[PDB]
Amino acid sequence: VILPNNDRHQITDTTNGHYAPVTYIQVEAPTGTFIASGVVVGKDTLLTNKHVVDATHGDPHALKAFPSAINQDNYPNGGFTAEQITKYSGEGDLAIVKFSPNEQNKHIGEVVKPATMSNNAETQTNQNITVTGYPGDKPVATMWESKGKITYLKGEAMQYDLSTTGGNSGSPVFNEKNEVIGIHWGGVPNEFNGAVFINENVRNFLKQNIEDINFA
């Protein structure tokens, strides 16, 4: 949701630095295309939300991912088709998506460097963070970095005061060190946006399920 802090910048050099694994997701269901975001976290693996993968209606092939998409049909790393989805077992709106190599035989986390996950030991309320992904109020498949502060950390949940819009589902939340601290899921109008906070349990889930995920 859009919040009083609406500080968003378009990333056009989407493959530079930490932005490269930020990924644009289209779930191409016959009923329509669900747009979302995600972050590549391993050679074959990206994180996004449960509600994003639910949009596949059980067909993981419906989920297409375009790391570092710059804009509409402008996908410097091509696209990848999901093959296996593992939802987080906890409440958090988090899902792991693994991709097959694409039709160019490349891997989603070889065409871009997977994100580095934070161990979140130093993450705290009031820290400046960004949530970077693919808001649906911007033009198709454009990446935007939205800036704000953590406002709430509780368990496996975080909230923040920065703005996002549908399309951002699954966007990585980055700290200042450009580590992923959480995975945005959405928000509550006029109140906050929120992410799954990658605390010890969620890190454990991720490490159990993604062999090459990198925590700092």
Catalytic residues: 51, 93, 169
Are 20 and 14 in contact by the 8 Å Cβ rule? The answer is: yes
Q: In whole angstroms, what is the distance from residue 28 CA to residue 34 CA?
A: 7
CB of 67 to K ion, least distance (A): 16
CB of 44 to K ion, least distance (A): 8
Nearer to K ion, 20 or 108 (CB): 108
Nearer to K ion, 77 or 165 (CB): 77
Half-sphere exposure of 12 (CA within 13 A, CB side): 0
**Residues for the chain: how many in total?**
216
Residues sharing a CB contact under 8 Å with residue 6, sequence separation 6 or more, in sequence order = 146, 162, 163
Are 21 and 112 in contact by the 8 Å Cβ rule? The answer is: yes
Binding mask of the shown chain, residues 83 to 112, with x at each position contacting K ion by CB under 5 A: ------------------x-----------
- CA 81 to chain centroid, in Å, comes to 16
Q: Which residue is nearest to K ion (CB)?
A: 101
CB of 107 to K ion, least distance (A): 6
Burial (Cβ within 10 Å: 0-12, 13-18, ≥19) of residue 194:
buried
For 138, the 3-state DSSP assignment is coil
CB of 167 to K ion, least distance (A): 30
Binding mask of the shown chain, residues 46 to 85, with x at each position contacting K ion by CB under 5 A: ----------------------------------------
Q: In whole angstroms, what is the distance from residue 39 CA to residue 122 CA?
A: 21
Nearer to K ion, 78 or 101 (CB): 101
Nearer to K ion, 76 or 101 (CB): 101
CB of 29 to K ion, least distance (A): 27
Are 151 and 161 in contact by the 8 Å Cβ rule? The answer is: yes
Nearer to K ion, 44 or 161 (CB): 44
* # binding residues, K ion (CB under 5 A): 1
Binding site for K ion (CB under 5 A): 101
